[PDB]
Design a protein around this ligand. Structure first.
Ligand SMILES: Nc1nc2c(ncn2[C@@H]2O[C@H](COP(=O)(O)OP(=O)(O)OP(=O)(O)O)[C@@H](O)[C@H]2O)c(=O)[nH]1
Ligand SMILES: Nc1nc2c(ncn2[C@@H]2O[C@H](COP(=O)(O)OP(=O)(O)O)[C@@H](O)[C@H]2O)c(=O)[nH]1
Ligand SMILES: Nc1nc2c(ncn2[C@@H]2O[C@H](COP(=O)(O)OP(=O)(O)O)[C@@H](O)[C@H]2O)c(=O)[nH]1
Ligand SMILES: [Mg+2]
Lengths: 440, 609, 427, 48, 427
């Protein structure tokens, strides 16, 4: 078992981390006080916590995480919440002034006031780690520090820690619905650092998650908490083999070389298959085929980009629970023989299957009914290029009139970087349409 | 399969610390004898058996109520030991409580019975807290620091929250129990610069001070309420090999033992002897018969004593082999004498009242063989050195020794009825034939066929040939008169016992395949093949002198009554826990006696004339 | 005398070798605690060939357990027969191979190769004459493929006259469990064709059919998918630890299965495989024993023997058998089926019975064939390499640890040159 | 934001703590400190 | 009737030496008080070598215990085996040798010499025919570096024909605990070359390494480090205290291992070192004691023995062993490693067997050798000297109790000549 810290930045990132660390401590057994009710002697010591927890001696297990947000409202609610003894006060770094939905005062002006304290605190976790695999950094592409401060982290963690698998769990803004007005700007100005020192940029937009909660999970009027519980179960298959045993154990370094074909192409999707509510959970049988089929379906995806109008290039399929290998490779066979699901010619192979032995633990009060055989898919398709293209249209419209710029340039940022992020996105879109032609 | 009767038991495993105990009803003793724990009655021959356990038990822990008795066994490293609770009133398993890997060193109960501390393992030492109510675990922590070593002792107090451990590396730590958070909190006791090695704990009756017995020969008294030392031991004239047993009285006194047997009653401030009496063997257990007037002392060379406090006069009530016992043989004619034969010792015993009359010790040496000459004038012995020592029946002097008899030990031995020839086996697989003159003990022939090792010699009723079981799968009927062979009986089992059926025409063979088989003395063919015991192998047999019953015991720790003509089974067992090595029909056909891998001499009332 | 230490490497190799050290341990008779409580002395006398010795009758496996991540070391030790392996042979690392062939060979395996070679160089000098080394691995993954073949080349230089046989798990046809599997297999047999004597090729999809269409097991696990390989691995070295009428050790197979020195990729097969319901409805006599092992269904390598010639032939029979039938049936396989046998070797039979059967089954065999249907296994890894090499794919995680694009052509040249040899003789 | 962790004291599932990742190679290979190998068996060395 | 006087000086010397008195009291059967309770009479037959007699048959060690502080004096006295020691042999100062070769040799160390040497005269003249003197002194620091070497010079002038053994903890380059340990070693070497017949150097770097990769201990403490040192110390004197098939006293492995008149810096090592975790999964035989000896791991003098050639090595064995396989393995290590031994000596290995082994095991051995690589243990301190002597660093302390810098230059020159003479006899 090895370790990985999780740097949550943004109001979004720490509220995703609120649902994540609730699930994390439940899987192992850590109570909100921070203590495990059974001791390491009793149990034939189970060091499954080590990937996300660290013992102090009195049984006080510790979240290997650093909550950061530059505005003090969403971080003080976890120093006053039920999980206030679990976290460490030095881990919960906060600031005074808002980023105010502005890239410039996330990276250049306000972000420099706390870039020293976080990089010291990453060092504190990294020193006591012995097998630190990856940085699981949670943020959203459509706000302040989640667009800002995370870019200054990505540059600093690469100079300091180098090759340590800088993963990135991220929240893209949606095609139609949006909770900001300046959102196109800070969503393409920060993707410089995303196509730079970050090796696997997982993608979720808020809009697709609402549709899953309505159709499959059968709740109308969903709030932001149910949207974050889905993200927590996404990690818990990505970090399941690092914490629990399985048939095909799959490491965090395994994920990259099994999903990134080219150094520029490093943007996967995420899909949880058996995500149904309890009343329609007596109803479906849910063996193995219907959930292998589920991730491969449009109205189960977690990003508003249809894989049918695109070609797959890499797809690791991670399974948990009571999954039998013959049931997988038959389900692999039956879905590799469907015309609408297209794989590019330079991937004759197909899928990376990962089998785990731990069924997903249900959050009490959560929506998701228990499933004894679950799937968390991490795809990689050319169809993500339409998700980059819809904000490209939206950015090009409100930049040609030079709107909402005097907030940006008058905060420590040069005008030239705006045009640099413009040409940078054209290059990545040209790369994705290039990597998906069939050479013949 | 009618049970015979189990009368009388000799045996005690004194090598465990804190062994022999007397429950507060003051009428029965409790002591461990293998992977079983006995209950011998005070003033009554009545004795019962606590079954269970796989390998040899290392711990006993009886309650202040007497209602609960616990124990703990050793196992192979990597495997999990089993702490077995019991009820003294009904003697039946009520918990298995398996957490500690490796083995156990010590158990202690809570004052009023609701927790058990069972510190276990030189490989996996970690103190745990049990529940006597839920039969389930509560707390858990490493029992020693990373700078210090490992702990082998536990004790409770007069309040059920304290639990105290010492060490062979100095981990004097007074813990405190914290049920709501389910954790324990240690506190190392400062003792100055006195790092010592200590192996025994006792506390006062009013929870004042706990008392230590170190290897240096020093009684360490320390405070559990200020976590500090109070008084060191004897300044001069310190004890011997370290104090291995301490038992604090209801007074301000303490019965301190030693590794030699110097049981001393001393007071607190000087720790100077008041009344000294020397015991044989290193003192491993000092119990109290409740009030403390009759304290029973157990020793590692297993001898249970009986000392009255007001005169310090002893009475040896139990005497045992302290090591593995092999070969029981009876003198010709009479059936009231044994030959209980073990490492470091050769003993004889009176059958009716178990009481030894001669002990023959050859230093740190092992005797795999014993035999009685027909004239009753020499106890022939086969020692691990390679020397055939022949001691005298009375006194115990060495009449003669045959130096360099066999190379790798002399294992199996047998005399002849003419009292002139001693047929000798060997661990190199050699059968030697010696001549016993009045002044010389020469060699006549060296018959060498067996490759591995010889296991059992048997001689017929009027001497012309002998059978020699061997560990390589061969049993040869050597011709004794013309110094040759006669047979090449062969099988795929490591033979461990062979016997001559009276009216000699066929021999019965045993071994590892549990395929008890009659074999003929002519043409050496298979006659029957009985199935021995379904569990392990068969070490030992004896056919009666009327040829109607042959008794059987083996690794299956269990005496088995088998009649001859039909292969039916009149099985009994429920005997002793420890691998039965040899067994012998009494000459008068009145008892059957088996030895075991742990020192234990069992007698059963032989049926079937 | 004759000695085989067992170099299990990788995740797959440690799992199969765990299953392998169980089927030896209930054949020679070993408890989880390494002690003998077996039955016969016709079972111990040659326990040397796989097991070392400690005090008190404590036979210890002669296996060097190596895997770059420390996770699979935990699974072997926590397994049922995991309390037997000596705790000095466990040579693990810190960072896993990532199923990256040079992450296993040139940059983290390079600091573990000098440590695992020391342990092999201790269990090789306690041998009067060591025959050779068996290395259980998988060509699909990383440290099994990359580090594993690094051990092969180093060993072949250190001990150059010993039987280097490898029990390999070569990629499956349709089932794919790694998208990095085409490159890992290609680089491995570039180092395996020249430095190994007997490459036994075990697929996965082939065994998937055997546990369904022959054995009828609805939900089979990897343990049952390694028991068939372990039964084969016991089968090869059977006239080497137990007595036989006509004996055959590893070299006697090797001299009789490799006509031409490059050509050594073989096909395992276990004959007596009965479904549980259909077990009482089948006589256990040698005519069905020879049929089933030559049948294309019980063929644990996904290369149909009807799609090619079948150069050299094994039947390492086990049990008390009459020698006429194993000369009659093997002749009947040849003469009647005079098409799927090469005309340029007169008689292709290496029948060799043992006396001691496997536990239970009173009859057995071990099918080891050098067919030229092997090329179908190495054409498919040659068409998906070239598809992935055409437009440079996953190579930024291949050249970063330090390699060249030159070695990919040299590795792929050794592929089609190997296939051309099996196509030269296919006619 | 308090909805994260209200029903935590009403567990719906008793946790199946069987398929874990309990470390055995780091805890059964490496001893703490005794140097037992060249030490005498000593007091209380009952063998199976 | 060949006795040894065991001197010990410094905190390190008093700690290792007290650990030595525990392992002799176990092999010779002495309880913590002092009474003989060993079983074998082969122990009481030579109780004179390291012990004396007193009233009531309480055997007392023949040791003089000296330190300039009563800090480790009270630790030895208040220990497990701390009452055996004579209560006047605890002869000590009170001031303190704050690390300085001056503060043991040219000041406060030099007033206690006239008292400790009276005890040495009293003990050496209670022997019938004393064999020699052994001293445990840390080469880096105060009492050991200084006063200990001062004691060596006085005893050598008084008793010139009796041998002088020194077990010395030379300062390691990586594990460092004092900053002036380069200064103390260079000044201590000069009075260890002309006044010592055998210098066993035992640095702390290898001792930590053996307790991590051989003994496999997570957290070694100072107690078990000296137990490895005490095992070697009770490996060279064993044929002075126990019978044997081929006996060898402390002079026989001096006449057969000191080639040239200075040439006497040796490297210790123990044969049967195993973890408790391994222990059972391993046999104890003569051809595996010799592998555990002739390597890097068990060489507690941390210095690569493959980067130099052994002049003369001996191996004093202890157990019930046969004289062929012992001599055969000593022959084999010379043939298969013919480049690791010099050629101008025909046989480089000396053999000794002592029947009675240490308590516990049934077999052991000791490995001391005159490797020419020991200059590497002496280059580093010279490098740590010249890069500390160039700018007169930390020297004003040294020239305060009376010491010219000319003594410093000649000590470095003598130690460089020590490296020279080992460098000449490479080939
Ligand atoms: N997944 C997820 N995304 C959220 C959540 N809440 C907000 N977001 C997304 O985050 C974006 C804005 O949040 P942040 O980036 O964290 O804004 P911020 O860090 O507070 O910026 P400043 O207040 O200026 O410092 C919105 O556009 C949402 O799309 C949430 O609970 N879960
Ligand atoms: N037969 C068998 N195959 C296995 C087993 N475990 C994994 N595999 C196969 O090995 C391939 C991947 O090998 P991998 O585990 O990555 O090897 P690694 O490089 O050591 O990690 C997959 O295609 C699996 O089918 C097993 O226990 N038995
Ligand atoms: N192996 C070992 N080394 C020790 C021990 N005690 C001290 N040392 C070493 O001795 C060195 C310091 O010696 P020092 O106490 O200054 O010698 P002194 O001034 O003569 O008393 C340190 O570098 C330690 O590594 C011990 O118990 N065992
Ligand atoms: Mg905010």
């Amino acid at each position: 078992m090895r370790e990985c810290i999780s740097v949550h930045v943004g109001q979004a990132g720490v509220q995703i981390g609120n649902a994540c660390w609730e699930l994390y401590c439940l899987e192992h057994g850590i109570q909100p006080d921070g203590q495990m009710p059974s001791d390491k002697t009793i149990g034939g010591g189970d060091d499954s916590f080590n990937t996300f927890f660290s013992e102090t001696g009195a049984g006080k297990h510790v979240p290997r995480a650093v909550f950061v947000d530059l505005e003090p409202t969403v971080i003080d609610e976890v120093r006053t919440g039920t999980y206030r003894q679990l976290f460490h006060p030095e881990q919960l770094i906060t600031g005074k002034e808002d980023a105010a939905n502005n890239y410039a005062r996330g990276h250049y002006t306000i972000g420099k006031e706390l870039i020293d304290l976080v990089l010291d605190r990453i060092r504190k976790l990294a020193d006591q780690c012995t097998g630190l695999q990856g940085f699981l950094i949670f943020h959203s592409f459509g706000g302040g520090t989640g667009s800002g401060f995370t870019s200054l982290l990505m540059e600093r963690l690469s100079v300091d820690y180098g090759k340590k698998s800088k993963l990135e769990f991220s929240i893209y803004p949606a095609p139609q619905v949006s909770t900001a007005v300046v959102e196109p700007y800070n969503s393409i100005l920060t993707t410089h650092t995303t196509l730079e020192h970050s090796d696997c940029a997982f993608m979720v937009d808020n809009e697709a998650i609402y549709d899953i909660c309505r159709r499959n999970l059968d709740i109308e009027r969903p709030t932001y908490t149910n949207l974050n519980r889905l993200i927590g179960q996404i990690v818990s298959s990505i970090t399941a083999s690092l914490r629990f045993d399985g048939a095909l154990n799959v490491d965090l370094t395994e994920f990259q070389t099994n999903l990134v074909p080219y150094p520029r192409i490093h943007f996967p999707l995420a899909t949880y298959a058996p995500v149904i509510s309890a009343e329609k959970a007596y109803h479906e049988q849910l063996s193995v085929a219907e959930i292998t089929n589920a991730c491969f379906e449009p109205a189960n995806q977690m990003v508003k980009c249809d894989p049918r109008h695109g070609k797959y290039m890499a797809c690791c399929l991670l399974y948990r629970g009571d999954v039998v290998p013959k049931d997988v490779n038959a389900a692999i066979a039956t879905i590799k023989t469907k015309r609408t699901i297209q794989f590019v010619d330079w991937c004759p192979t197909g899928f990376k299957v990962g089998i785990n032995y731990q069924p997903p633990t249900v959050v009490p009060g959560g929506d998701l009914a228990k499933v004894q055989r679950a799937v968390c898919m991490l795809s990689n398709t050319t169809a993500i290029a339409e998700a980059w293209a819809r904000l490209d249209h939206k950015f090009d419209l409100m930049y040609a009139k030079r709107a909402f710029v005097h907030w940006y340039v008058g905060e420590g940022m040069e005008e030239g970087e705006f045009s640099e992020a413009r040409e940078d996105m054209a290059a990545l879109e040209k790369d994705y349409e290039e990597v998906g032609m069939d050479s013949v | 399969a009618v049970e015979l009767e189990l009368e009388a038991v000799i045996g005690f495993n004194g090598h465990v610390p804190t062994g022999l105990k007397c429950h507060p009803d003051q009428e029965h003793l409790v002591y461990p004898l293998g992977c079983t724990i006995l209950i011998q009655a005070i003033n009554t021959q009545e004795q019962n058996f606590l079954h269970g356990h796989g390998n040899n038990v290392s711990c006993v822990a009886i309650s202040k109520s007497g209602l609960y008795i616990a124990s703990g066994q050793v196992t192979f490293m990597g495997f999990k030991a089993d702490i077995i609770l019991w009820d003294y009133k009904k003697r039946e398993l009520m918990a298995r409580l398996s957490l500690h890997k490796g083995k156990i060193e010590a158990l202690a109960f809570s004052p009023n019975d609701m927790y058990l501390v069972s510190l276990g393992g030189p490989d996996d030492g970690s103190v745990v807290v049990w529940s006597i109510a839920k039969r389930e675990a509560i707390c858990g922590s490493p029992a020693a620091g990373l700078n210090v070593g490992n702990a082998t002792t536990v004790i409770f107090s007069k309040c059920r929250d304290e639990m105290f451990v010492t060490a062979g590396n100095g981990t004097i730590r007074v813990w405190e129990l914290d049920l709501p958070n389910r954790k324990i909190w240690p506190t190392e006791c400062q003792t100055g610069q006195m790092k010592r090695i200590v192996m025994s704990i006792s506390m006062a009756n009013d929870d004042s001070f706990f008392y230590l017995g170190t290897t240096t020969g020093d009684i360490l008294k320390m405070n559990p309420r200020t976590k500090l030392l109070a008084d060191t031991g004897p300044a001069k004239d310190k004890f011997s090999l370290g104090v291995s047993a301490i038992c604090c009285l209801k007074m301000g006194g303490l019965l301190v033992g030693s590794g030699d047997g110097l049981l001393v009653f001393c007071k607190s401030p000087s720790y100077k002897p008041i009344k000294k009496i020397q015991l044989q063997g290193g003192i491993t257990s000092i119990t109290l018969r409740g009030e403390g007037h009759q304290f029973f002392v157990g020793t590692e060379e297993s001898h249970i004593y009986r000392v009255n406090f007001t005169n310090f006069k002893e009475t040896l009530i139990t005497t045992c082999h302290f090591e593995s016992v092999e070969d029981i043989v009876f003198p010709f004619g009479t059936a009231e004498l044994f030959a209980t034969c073990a490492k470091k010792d050769i003993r004889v015993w009176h059958t009716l009242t178990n009481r030894e009359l001669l002990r023959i010790t050859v230093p740190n040496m092992t005797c795999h063989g014993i035999d009685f000459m027909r004239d009753g004038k020499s106890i022939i012995s086969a020692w691990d050195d390679g020397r055939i020592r022949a001691f005298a029946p009375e006194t115990g002097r060495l009449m003669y020794v045959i130096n360099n008899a066999h190379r790798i030990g002399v294992t199996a031995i047998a005399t002849t009825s003419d009292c002139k020839r001693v047929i000798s086996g060997g661990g190199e697989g050699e059968v030697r034939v010696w001549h016993i003159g009045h002044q010389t003990q020469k060699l006549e022939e060296a018959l060498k066929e067996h490759k591995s090792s010889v296991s059992c010699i048997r001689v017929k009723k009027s001497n012309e040939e002998c059978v020699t079981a061997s560990t390589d799968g061969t049993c040869i009927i050597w011709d004794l008169v013309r110094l040759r062979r006669n047979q090449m009986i062969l099988a795929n089992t490591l033979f461990q016992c062979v016997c001559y059926h009276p009216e000699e025409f066929q021999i019965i063979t045993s071994g590892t395949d549990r395929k008890i088989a009659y074999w003929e003395v002519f043409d050496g063919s298979v006659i029957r093949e009985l199935d021995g015991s379904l569990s392990g192998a068969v070490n030992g047999m004896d056919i009666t002198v009327e040829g109607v019953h042959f008794v059987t015991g083996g690794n299956d720790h269990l005496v088995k009554v088998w009649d001859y003509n039909e292969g039916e089974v009149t099985h009994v067992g429920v005997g002793h826990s420890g691998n039965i090595t040899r067994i012998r029909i009494s000459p008068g056909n009145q008892y059957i006696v088996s030895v075991s891998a742990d020192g234990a001499i069992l007698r059963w009332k032989y049926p079937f004339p | 005398m004759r000695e085989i230490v067992h170099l299990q490497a990788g995740q797959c190799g440690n799992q199969i070798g765990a299953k392998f050290w169980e089927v030896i341990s209930d054949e020679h008779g070993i408890d989880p605690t390494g002690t003998y409580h077996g039955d016969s002395d016709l079972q111990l006398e040659r326990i040397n060939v796989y097991y070392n010795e400690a005090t008190g009758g404590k036979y210890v496996p002669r296996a060097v357990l190596v895997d770059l991540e420390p996770g699979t070391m935990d699974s072997v030790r926590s397994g049922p027969f995991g309390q037997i392996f000596r705790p000095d042979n466990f040579v693990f690392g810190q960072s896993g191979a990532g199923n990256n062939w040079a992450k296993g060979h040139y940059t983290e395996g390079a600091e573990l190769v000098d440590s695992v070679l020391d342990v092999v160089r201790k269990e090789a000098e306690s041998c009067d004459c060591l025959q050779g080394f068996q290395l259980t691995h998988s060509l699909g993954g990383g440290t099994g493929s990359g580090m594993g073949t690094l051990l092969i080349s180093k060993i072949r230089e250190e001990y150059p006259d010993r039987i280097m046989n490898t029990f390999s798990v070569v990629p499956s046809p349709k089932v794919s469990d790694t998208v990095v599997e085409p490159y890992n297999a290609t680089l491995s047999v570039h180092q395996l064709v020249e430095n190994t004597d007997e490459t036994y090729c075990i697929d996965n999809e082939a065994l998937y059919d055997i546990c369904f269409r022959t054995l009828k097991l609805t939900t089979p696990t990897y343990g049952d998918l390694n028991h068939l390989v372990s039964a084969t691995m016991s089968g090869v070295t059977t006239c080497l630890r137990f007595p036989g009428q006509l004996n055959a050790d590893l070299r006697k197979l090797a001299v009789n299965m490799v006509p031409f020195p490059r050509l050594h990729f073989f096909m395992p097969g276990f004959a007596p495989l009965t479904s549980r319901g259909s077990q009482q409805y089948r006589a256990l006599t040698v005519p069905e024993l020879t049929q089933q092992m030559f049948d294309a269904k019980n063929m644990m390598a996904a290369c149909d023997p009807r799609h090619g010639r079948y150069l050299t032939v094994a039947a390492v029979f086990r049990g008390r058998m009459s020698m006429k039938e194993v000369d009659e049936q093997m002749l009947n396989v040849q003469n009647k089926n005079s098409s799927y046998f090469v005309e340029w070797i007169p008689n292709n039979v290496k029948t060799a019975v043992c006396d001691i059967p496997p536990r239970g089954l009173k009859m057995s065999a071990t099918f080891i064939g050098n067919s030229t249907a092997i090329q179908e296994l190495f054409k498919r890894i040659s068409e998906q390499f070239t598809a992935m090499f055409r437009r440079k794919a996953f190579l930024h995680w291949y050249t970063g640890e330090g390699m060249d694009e030159m070695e990919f052509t040299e590795a792929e040249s050794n592929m089609n040159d190997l296939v051309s040899e099996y196509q030269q003789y296919q006619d | 934001s308090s909805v994260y962790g209200r029903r935590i004291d009403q567990p719906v599932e008793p946790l199946n703590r069987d398929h874990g990742r309990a470390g055995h190679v780091k805890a059964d290979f490496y001893r703490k400190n005794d140097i037992t190998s060249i030490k005498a068996p000593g007091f209380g060395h009952i063998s199976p």
